[PDB]
Amino acid sequence: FANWVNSLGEKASPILTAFENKTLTAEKLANAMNLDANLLEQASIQAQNYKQVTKENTFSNWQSIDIILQWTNIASNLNISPQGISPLIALDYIKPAQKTPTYAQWENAAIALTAGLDTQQTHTLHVFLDESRSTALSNYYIGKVA
């Protein structure tokens, strides 16, 4: 918490006394981090979709704020808005063991992960995907089509 306050720095007094009251909002919080407010809004909504971050203490609890910060950190890693990380986690093998994911869901998550990449990573991705499709097609061809 002290490292978070030191990360804030200059705007610390108004945001700490807004946290001291129960009226702390996402919008004042985003301005101290130079971040777009809709990102924090969607991170809060995605945490509310999962196990509880209660809509009252969604910015009154420090723990809730830390959880939403972890959502923003993992969104900052993949460079993807955190509603795209929701079906990613919903593509688990055993967690939706009722609803087995279809191929199109894998496609929609894969293209969302694909869009976030830069030039060296996308060249290396084309290299590896073409090398995989080579031995993927070749062994099936030998098996059935030849």
């Binding site: 999962y50 959880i67 972890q70 959502w71 950190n73 993992i74 890693n77 993949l78 990380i85 986690i89 593509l91 688990d92 093998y93 055993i94 967690k95 191929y103 894998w106 496609e107 998550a109 894969a110 992960l113 694909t114 976030g116 990449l117 990573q121 290396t124 991705l125 590896f128 995907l129 995989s132 499709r133 031995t135 993927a136 062994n139 099936y140 098996g143």
Partner: protein
């Protein structure tokens, strides 16, 4: 075939993840989102 399955979109997913974050430091450093996903999925990242 003696070496496959091959799920193409899945290989796209797992290499996109391995190019973003090696060693899952950003993932398991923040343990709440690790509390979301089961470990069986996390086996699916480094191993195909």
């Amino acid at each position: 075939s003696g070496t496959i399955p091959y799920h193409d979109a899945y290989e796209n997913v797992r290499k996109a993840i391995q190019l973003q974050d090696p060693k899952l430091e950003q993932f398991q450093k923040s343990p709440a989102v690790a509390g979301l996903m089961h470990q069986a999925s996390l086996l699916g990242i480094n191993n195909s």
